[PDB]
Amino acid sequence: RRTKLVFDDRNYSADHYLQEAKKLKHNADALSDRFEKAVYYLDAVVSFIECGNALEKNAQESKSPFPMYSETVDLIKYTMKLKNYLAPDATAADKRLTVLCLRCESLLYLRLFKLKKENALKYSKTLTEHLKNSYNNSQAPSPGLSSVTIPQKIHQMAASYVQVTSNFLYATEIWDQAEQLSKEQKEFFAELDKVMGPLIFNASIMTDLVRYTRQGLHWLRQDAK
C-alpha cells in the first residue's frame, strides 16, 4: 500500500530548482483549499531547499545560500499558518504535514547557523572577556573594608553574535517541537523513519531532508488524493 519514491539522481543547477519551486509556489498561491495550498507550499519548500543545496555544492560556480534558506524558513512559517495543527478538528494529515514542515524549518535554521558558525567562537572569546570588562557610567568602584559603555566593535560583534546564535536556538526549539508532535502520529512517522532512515538533527544533510520530506508528502498525498 505504501511505496517508496525512486529519486532523481541528477544534480541540476540552482536556477532549475528555483524555477521548479516558483512554479510550485505559484500553484499553491492560486489554489484555495488550504490543505492542498500547504502541500504545494511544502513541495515548493523542498524545491527551494534543493536550490539552496545547489547554490552550495555547485562545483564550478558557488554563491551564498543564506538568503535562500532564510526566505524558505519564512515560507514554511507562512505555510504552517493555514491548517493549524492545534485546531479542534485538525486531521492526521494536518499534523503529519506540520511535523514535516517543522523538520524542514529546524534543519534550515541549523544550516543558517552553520553557514556563519565560524564567527561565533571568535566572538564568544572576545565578548566574554569584554563583558566582564564593562563596569562604567553609574557606580565608580567603591573601596571598602543604570548604564554601561562598551566599544563600538564590541557592540557590532554582540549584535552579529546574537544574530548567529538565534539560528540554532530556533533550530533546537523547533526540532524538539517536531519530536513532540510526532508522538501523536508515531505510527506514520515510524514507518517513514523505517523506509528513509530517521532525520538526525546535527547529521542529516539537505538531500536527506529533501528525500524524507518528499516521501512524507507522497504518503500524505496518497492518503488524501
Numbering used by the authors: 902 to 1046, 1081 to 1160
What do the paper's sentences say?
In this study we identified AFF4, a scaffold protein of the Super Elongation Complex (SEC), as an important transcriptional elongation factor required for ESR1 gene expression. In mammalian cells, the active form of P-TEFb is tightly associated with additional elongation factors ELL1/2/3, EAF1/2, AF9/ENL, as well as AFF4/1 to form the Super Elongation Complex (SEC). Importantly, AFF4, the scaffold subunit of the SEC, is largely responsible for this histone mark recognition activity. AFF4 belongs to the AFF(AF4/FMR2) family which contains four members: AFF1/AF4, AFF2/FMR2, AFF3/LAF4, and AFF4/AF5q31.
Surprisingly, the 2.2 Å structure shows an all α-helical homodimeric structure, instead of the predominantly β-sheet YEATS domain-like structure. Helices α5 and α6 are extensively involved in homodimerization. Phe1103, the residue identified to be important for H3K27ac interaction, is located in the middle of α6 and involved in dimerization via stacking with the same residue from another molecule. In consistent with the structural result, AFF4 dimerization was abolished by a rather large deletion of residues 971–1117, but was not affected by the single mutation F1103A in cells. Our structural result contrasts the expectation of a YEATS domain suggested by sequence alignment, and precludes direct participation of Phe1103 in H3K27ac interaction in the present form. Our structural result reveals that the 901–1163 region of AFF4 is a dimerization module, instead of a complete H3K27ac-interacting domain.
